[PDB]
Design a protein around this ligand. Structure first.
Ligand code: NA
Length: 419
């Protein structure tokens, strides 16, 4: 008679090892009788545990995740033999091992099979009776998601647009693995590349989030800028209210430089978590999550001041307004100079009004131009389209470079005839 173990929640690219711990006879109620040591336990190390039947009897009835069982699992891990080993290549989702001799098996990932492999982790060492059932593998990784607050709402997303006058809030959400409780200690280091075209405001806070509440835990972390923006704690177990269901949230703000990337390329940052990847035998190996990217788009509104003779004209000055409600309020003001060109570097989608606050000598003051910018960002976070339209004016756009160009034509007054 042989048996089957099926592991759910498995990933591709693993080699699971089953070590035969106890032999015996399994009945219909999954009671194991006539127990001897399997070949999975090294003959030399069997004396340390004693008689097999009595050792089985000592554990009989104890809960699945009790302390006595997990202690035996760890002790066994140091007492294994290849003579009772079955190795199986993993599959994504479900991994099945059949043709097993009756009895008790220890399951683990193969030693060194996952070193420096991103987004993976060694399973907590399992003990299973082979009994034709499916069991969830006791293996899981933390996740990290980097997001930025939407320009036009409170919700956080992968990509948005912002202006030079805005504060740009970022949020990094970390989940912990379901088997966080099995670790004696847990290395936790978040690295963020930060954004090339932005200045970090240095207002970083860390939060323990669970049960609909947040507690600031910022002082427990080492926050450095020697190698990206790194938020680290040597051992997250030192924070005793952090558990498998806890979320760690990092929030900071930033502002665009006036050299920020314009258009479709955008201003991106990547972040990843470095985490303890093996809960067994107080291992201190680490692995990294895949990068999580956020992107911030911005544009450049250029005015070119000309007259009807198609000459460039100096001495104009423009005040840009943004509409918050019905209320228009000033965001930028370029005074009159010897320049005929005006760059509002760092503008986003929204409703604006443009006012010629200084008129050049010997020309009519233009009427105010109310206009609207739109950004089309697809669900991948990529900027697809941008527009700029007015009732009483026309713009030229280059969505790739992120240019919005307005030609303002100065008209001279009327030299009126007398009679
Ligand atoms: Na796995």
């Amino acid at each position: 008679t042989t048996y089957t173990i099926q592991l759910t929640g498995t990933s591709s690219g693993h080699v699971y090892e089953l070590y035969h711990i106890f032999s015996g006879d399994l009945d219909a109620n999954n009671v194991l009788t006539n127990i001897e040591w399997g070949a999975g336990v090294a003959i030399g190390d069997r004396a340390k545990f004693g008689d097999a039947s009595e050792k089985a009897a000592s554990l009989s009835g104890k809960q699945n995740d009790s302390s006595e069982v997990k202690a035996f699992a760890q002790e066994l891990s140091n007492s294994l033999s290849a003579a009772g080993r079955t190795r199986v290549r993993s599959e994504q989702g479900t991994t099945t091992i059949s043709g097993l001799k009756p009895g008790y098996y220890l399951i683990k990932d193969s030693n060194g099979s996952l070193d420096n492999v991103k987004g993976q982790a060694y399973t907590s060492i399992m003990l299973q009776v082979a009994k034709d059932t499916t069991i969830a593998i006791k293996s899981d990784v933390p996740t990290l998601t980097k997001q930025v607050k939407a320009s036009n709402s409170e919700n956080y997303i992968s990509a948005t647009d912002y202006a030079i006058w805005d504060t740009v809030p970022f949020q990094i959400t970390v989940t912990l693995p379901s088997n966080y409780g099995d670790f004696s200690k847990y290395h936790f280091s978040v690295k963020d590349s930060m954004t090339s075209g932005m200045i970090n405001n240095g207002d970083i806070q860390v939060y323990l989030q669970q049960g609909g509440s947040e507690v600031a835990i910022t002082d427990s972390f080492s926050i450095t800028t020697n190698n990206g923006l790194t938020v680290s704690i040597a051992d997250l177990k030192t924070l005793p209210n952090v558990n498998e269901n806890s979320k760690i949230v990092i929030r900071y703000t930033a502002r665009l430089k006036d050299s920020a990337t314009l258009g479709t390329t955008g201003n991106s940052n990547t972040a990843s978590l470095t985490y303890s990847n093996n809960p067994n035998n107080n291992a201190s190996t680490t692995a990294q999550t895949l990068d999580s990217r956020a992107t911030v788009y911005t544009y450049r509104l250029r005015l070119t001041k000309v007259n009807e003779r198609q000459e460039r004209v100096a001495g104009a000055g423009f005040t840009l307004y943004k509409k918050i409600n019905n209320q228009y309020s000033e965001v930028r003001k370029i005074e009159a100079s010897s320049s005929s060109t005006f760059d509002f570097y760092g503008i986003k989608a929204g409703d604006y009004k443009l006012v010629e606050s200084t008129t050049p000598a010997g020309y009519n003051t233009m009427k105010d131009i109310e206009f609207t910018i739109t950004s089309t960002i697809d669900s991948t976070g990529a900027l697809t389209d941008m527009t700029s339209t007015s009732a009483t004016a026309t713009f030229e756009t280059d969505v790739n470079r992120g240019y919005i160009n307005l030609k303002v034509v100065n008209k001279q007054g009327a030299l009126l005839p007398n009679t």
